[PDB]
Ligand binder design. Sequence first.
Ligand SMILES: CCCCCCCCCCCCCCCCCC(=O)OC[C@H](COP(=O)([O-])OCC(O)COP(=O)([O-])OC[C@@H](COC(=O)CCCCCCCCCCCCCCCCC)OC(=O)CCCCCCCCCCCCCCCCC)OC(=O)CCCCCCCCCCCCCCCCC
Ligand SMILES: CCCCCCCCCCCCCCCCC[C@@H](O)O[C@H](CO[C@H](O)CCCCCCCCCCCCCCC)COP(=O)(O)OCC[N+](C)(C)C
Ligand SMILES: CCCCCCCCCCCCCCCCC[C@@H](O)O[C@H](CO[C@H](O)CCCCCCCCCCCCCCC)COP(=O)(O)OCC[N+](C)(C)C
Lengths: 52, 606, 64, 56, 458, 175, 178
Amino acid sequence: STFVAYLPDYRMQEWARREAERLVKYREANGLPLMESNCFDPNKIQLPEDED
Amino acid sequence: MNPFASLTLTTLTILTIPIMMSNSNIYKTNLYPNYVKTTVSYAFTLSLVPLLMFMHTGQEMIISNWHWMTLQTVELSLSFKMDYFSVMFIPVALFVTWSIMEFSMWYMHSDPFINRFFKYLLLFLITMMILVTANNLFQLFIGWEGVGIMSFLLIGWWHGRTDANTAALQAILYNRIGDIGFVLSMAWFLTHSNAWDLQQIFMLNNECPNMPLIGLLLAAAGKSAQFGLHPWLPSAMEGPTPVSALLHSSTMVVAGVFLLIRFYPLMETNKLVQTMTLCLGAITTLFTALCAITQNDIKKIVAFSTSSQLGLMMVTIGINQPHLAFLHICMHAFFKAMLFMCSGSIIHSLNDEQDIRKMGGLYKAMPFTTTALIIGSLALTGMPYLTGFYSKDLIIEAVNMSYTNAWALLMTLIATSLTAAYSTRIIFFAFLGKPRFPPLVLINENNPLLINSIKRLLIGSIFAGFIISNNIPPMTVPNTTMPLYMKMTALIVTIMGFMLALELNNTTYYLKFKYPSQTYKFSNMLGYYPSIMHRLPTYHNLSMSQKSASSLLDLIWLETILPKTTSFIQMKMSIMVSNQKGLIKLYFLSFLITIMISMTLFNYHE
Amino acid sequence: IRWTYARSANIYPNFRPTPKTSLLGALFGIGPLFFWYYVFKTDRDKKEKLIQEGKLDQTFNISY
Amino acid sequence: NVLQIVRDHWVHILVPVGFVFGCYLDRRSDEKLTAFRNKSLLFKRELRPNEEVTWK
Amino acid sequence: MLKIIIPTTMLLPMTWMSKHNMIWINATVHSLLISLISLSLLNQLGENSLNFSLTFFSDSLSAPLLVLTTWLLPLMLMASQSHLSKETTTRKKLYITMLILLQLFLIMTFTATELILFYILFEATLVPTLIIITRWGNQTERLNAGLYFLFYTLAGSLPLLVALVYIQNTTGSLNFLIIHYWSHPLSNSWSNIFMWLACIMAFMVKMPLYGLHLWLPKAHVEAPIAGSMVLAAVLLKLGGYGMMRITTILNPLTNYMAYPFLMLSMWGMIMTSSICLRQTDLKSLIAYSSVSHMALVIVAIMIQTPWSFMGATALMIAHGLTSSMLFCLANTNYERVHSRTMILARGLQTLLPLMATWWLVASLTNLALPPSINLIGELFIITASFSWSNITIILMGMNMMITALYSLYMLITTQRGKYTHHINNIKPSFTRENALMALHILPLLLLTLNPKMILGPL
Amino acid sequence: PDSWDKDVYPEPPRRTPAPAPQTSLPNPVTYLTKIFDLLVDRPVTLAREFIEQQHAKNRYYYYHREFRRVPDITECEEKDILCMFEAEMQWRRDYKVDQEIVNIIQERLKACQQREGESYRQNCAKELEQFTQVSKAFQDRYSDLGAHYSARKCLAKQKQRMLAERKAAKEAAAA
Amino acid sequence: AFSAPAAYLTHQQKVLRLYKRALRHLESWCVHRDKYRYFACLMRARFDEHKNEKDMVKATQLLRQAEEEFWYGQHPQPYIFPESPGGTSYERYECYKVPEWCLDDWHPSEKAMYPDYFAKREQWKRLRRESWEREVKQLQEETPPGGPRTEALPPARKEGDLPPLWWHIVTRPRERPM
Ligand SMILES: CCCCCCCCCCCCCCCCCC(=O)OC[C@H](COP(=O)([O-])OCC(O)COP(=O)([O-])OC[C@@H](COC(=O)CCCCCCCCCCCCCCCCC)OC(=O)CCCCCCCCCCCCCCCCC)OC(=O)CCCCCCCCCCCCCCCCC
Ligand SMILES: CCCCCCCCCCCCCCCCC[C@@H](O)O[C@H](CO[C@H](O)CCCCCCCCCCCCCCC)COP(=O)(O)OCC[N+](C)(C)C
Ligand SMILES: CCCCCCCCCCCCCCCCC[C@@H](O)O[C@H](CO[C@H](O)CCCCCCCCCCCCCCC)COP(=O)(O)OCC[N+](C)(C)C
């Protein structure tokens, strides 16, 4: 139980919290939206030419 | 660092120390009950300080101290809400528990397992504090089920007695029916608001839909023993008297009402659920007050009185007055616990007799118990300027002056008359007249523990209403102008109930005997609700779970289709294939047939 | 011993497929399944149709 | 006198020895999967003035 | 991960070279040491799995299962040595060998990287279980139980094998990482439907699914105590683990292939909970309890959401511990009175108080009292089902009411009331039995203290 | 204190009124808080000072781990296993970071609701709006992927949404 | 509870049982003592009015009518003595009752306390062991060939005999054991 209780953070919870803190600080400072509905840049996506 | 948070946490923390000491050389001695009682008294004295801070500056807090686990976007943390409700309820519950523990030191003196009894009482108190101070729905559910399990264990204290085990399982069944609604509310809140804590739930629900509130109402009806799920509370009188005075009268059974008081911002914006709550409370209070007026066991009368007062609390919640309902909870705790303790004193004096028909004239034989019971009855009936007045009188006036269902109003008035009626029944049959107990008189109330506990609760029942009313901020708008007759409605109906009950009780002295009416039979047998509802559904469920689920399906048809059919088919084919006489003539003819078939069917087609 | 044996092991050897046995088995072993299937399929079809039209009020619905 | 003690309790080294041998075999297995050591786009790094490999 | 596999293979000759009166001590000590070593697998990542080699890997789903297996072996050894005292030395060593081989097969099954290796080990677990049941069971029904245990499994697993090899001819690999990364949707054709059924039915019969569960009461009642422990705690979870692995290639067919199984799971959960209310044999009640909990797990796996997967993992771990503890508790009374009838021995709280406390705690965890991990898994699954459809709260709700009832019923029948007058051979509880109960129950609450270790990869 | 960034977790300037006694009676709260100070806050402060003195004699550091950016799943060939692996790991890390962003916003919302008291419905409008925006973006990105989610399924979802939006825009243009 | 039942109840027994039940329920209705005494005297007069009926058929018809009237007019909540089968303390102390054979399993350290008590227990066990076979022989002699017809047991008749099947009656735990 002691060994499990002190297992090092390989799940990266604290790292993720710190990264999110930096992201929120930067985006709130520059007035950008906190999150984008697209997680991939559309300039790297080629849609089909014709939809008709 | 603003001692509010530290003191609020320490009050709850120090209650667990005797639980940790229950495996030391104090649980094996005769000093354990006093140790637990002293711990509870110290906890009450400490908790008095955050209450003073709130009464001075209105200080409130939430403390999220331990992060338990976090889902993807949902964070679950050990958080305590220290608002007005928590800081007001904790001292009241601690005071009542202190008095009841000192009483139990005398009532359960002959019990060989008194240490386990006190350990059990403390565990219930801890679970109730967890329920009351919770800030998220998971912690509240922990407290909910903890008090449920503690009540199950304390109802079946005498576990060799069949009726106690039956009553404990009945309480569990009804509470599980309520827990269904609790879980429905939890699931709805997590899937729609992405939270289980109160702050986000309040932020994200400006107009709450029906489903979560209906789930909360079902859970409250289960926990507070409302009309649909009422019968378990009177049957919980199978436990020892201190359990009835603490768990099933004043502290645990208000929990459901407390739940609706916690979510009052959401209930404030839904008219249909409010109407449902009002009607449920009205029918509950009427039905229970009507059952109480013919009962002969004193514990049953007090239990039905508690159920009727819970119905009145539900009515108060239904008319959008949650703070009045909380005030009524606090007021009712005092005199209800005192009434149960006086009943226990009578029972212990008369060799564990609980029937009022065998209690004669105890007015002079038991003076202090008589005084305490009279004061408690007067407080319960809303007599002016006592503890019960400052909540019940305002509740009746608010019900009168609101846009409300008219039938609910009528049932509330009839119930508040029946309250005085059954109080009159208790006093008249238990204290007035000539003795009816066995001739070997062992009446003795001269014991400092009993006297001190009852005296503390009596001082509370006299002064707590005034003290608490004059020290809280006003959270409601007062009904300043009313017609005089509607201002006197509660007093008038109480007086009429008193007079009618006194007349009908005085008629019992006559030398006339008549067989009872059907209305009396309906009242005495609890509307026949336990007679039908505890026999028909249980019989059908158990009979179906044997005849159909176990026998017809699991033992017959499921066996018949897959394994038995396979075994039968394989056995028949084995018999067909292997049973040959061993005559070369027959299977050489078979060889000829095979050769011709193989030459025609497969060989002709190439 | 006789009671427990009769309740457990003596049941199948004394079973005969009869109109009563067959009808009760079919009813109580098939009817509930199709009842619940119809209920759940109807509810989920309604929810899916509502979602396609874009009117279900799925705001703040993050966890599933 | 340690003869009888050894012949009675020599079965108590089998499992620790198996644990050590399993650790050694796991290291040997790791030795056969170094085709991308210090070659991933995420972790590619210049070597220190002394160290030879990034991991073993 | 040979640092766990090799010490068990060393347990084998250590047992077969031990002195005749030291087999239990040595086996227990080194089993506990192996469990302590396996405790290190709980250090998992947030992105991918621990890929030890080309053959073995550890995920956040399989590590708690491995820990449970390695922890269950010493408990089985402790529970078995009482009723095997009269046995010869060679047969005792053979019994311990069966237990060790079962542990080895389970350990390799939970960490195999390829699906055919997983299939081979998951079938190899059959032989030691069948031998244990049919050789060391007490009554004549054990033989029939063994047959029911075998063919019910194989009739499910033989189609799966075919499907597996077919898949390897289509995609070129059965490695789970390759299968996950190169996933392609399943179209709606009859061939795809039958491939789905072949991939699902073996795990369904392992859970077991309601309607395919008849083997379980027989096998779990007729088995010796260690057999029942390992059947309820670990071997039922093979189906859930395999289903959660295999569902990565079955989308979007599952979207509508799950309906009959969902209906069966919910209604049969109600049905088996109801069956528990009228049961004369105490072991059969615990078996039907296992069936109800596994129906919940099946629903969670079939609806395919992160919350349902977390709930399924937590429920499997919690149920394993709780059901093993309940079987041991029933076995104590059986060894005292030599009968499994529940109403034979009553009022046992008066005679055995500490055992009554153990009974109370086990029945409290069975009904999922908060904040036990039983309740955490059940609540996560119920919330996911509510998101799937708001009407499920009815059936789930009914289940929550029935479970507690029968659970408390069991307690009230065995511990409360008055003792049977003519039963005069109820001796005080041994230290071994109390230690067994404690070693079951303490890890449950310790896991409650840190629930993210049993919540899986989601 | 300085443990957390005050721009990520902002608070109002904390205006509190000065005591205005109107009665000759003493204040039990002030007397009790003086006793609490002298009897509790000082020994705890001394213990913390000793512990911090011990800590200062042994000062060592840990670092936040830095991850560079690798090509996304859009720049990966169909069967290129290594690029897909790196892109999938990057996508999972981004998913965790987005979850923590939502968690921060929810913490702000809850704190504002508790802080504002009886005026929360009006005084928490900005936090509610921020949570609404973040929740909408997160729901667009990650909802309905199901168990067995991946970067490829997220990309397929984004492509489907983009196609629907492009069709709607072109149909509104023809109006 | 102590007496062995007969095969059936006689007419007089049924009349007396109805009389007791009627008086108890009337007391339940008539709470006060003087009123109960008045109506109990009236009930006794009504009972002994038909005491001298030589026609048995008419007597049983009267008993039938009386039982129907009782069932119509019974108190739905009659007074029950607290330890009676319907009372509030019926089986309250059954959990405190421990059979004597448990004392055989006490650890010798526990038996080191109470030496005299356990010496007396050994004496009682010796007496039971010496008496058992004589009890069995007496039961074998006194039993009719077609088995016993009632549950009544005989007393001891010889010089130093003990009444057969006495151990579990004599060594009852207690009414208030703990
Ligand atoms: C001024 C403006 C305000 C106006 C208000 C109204 C004006 C009128 C003023 C007075 C009104 C009420 C007066 C008292 C009532 C009578 C009391 C009484 O006991 O009478 C004796 C008699 C029976 O006595 P008993 O059997 O000989 O007693 C046994 C022994 O004495 C055994 O003795 P015991 O020691 O066991 O004790 C027995 C016990 C109890 O004995 C009993 O069991 C009898 C129960 C009677 C009391 C119940 C009252 C509560 C009514 C609630 C009803 C809600 C609706 C229910 C609908 C049912 C639907 C089926 O006695 C008591 O303890 C006292 C009883 C209560 C006294 C206090 C009365 C207060 C409550 C009512 C008055 C309210 C005052 C203020 C109003 C405020 C409103 C603005 O009761 C009755 O027969 C009448 C009861 C009324 C029931 C009517 C329901 C209808 C019945 C037929 C149904 C028709 C069916 C049609 C077809 C339908 C097809 C579907
Ligand atoms: C008999 C008498 C009983 C009553 C008397 C008891 C007296 C008091 C003792 C009771 C203690 C009360 C418990 C209160 C909790 C305090 C401890 C808690 O704070 O520690 C937890 C830690 O608990 C452990 O994590 C959980 C234990 C792990 C469980 C593994 C069990 C061991 C394996 C056994 C076999 C496995 C079988 C099951 C297979 C799955 C918190 O973890 P965490 O919030 O992070 O800590 C953050 C800081 N860290 C990370 C730097 C450490
Ligand atoms: C005791 C418990 C055992 C375990 C339970 C296992 C559950 C297995 C149940 C299988 C679930 C569904 C299987 C196939 C999916 C649809 C089945 C069919 O009924 O649906 C319609 C099928 O239409 C008709 O029903 C044709 C099928 C009728 C013949 C099937 C025989 C079923 C009769 C019941 C026999 C019992 C089977 C189980 C034996 C134990 C849909 O119309 P259609 O869109 O065109 O078909 C979709 C496939 N397409 C697209 C390729 C064309």
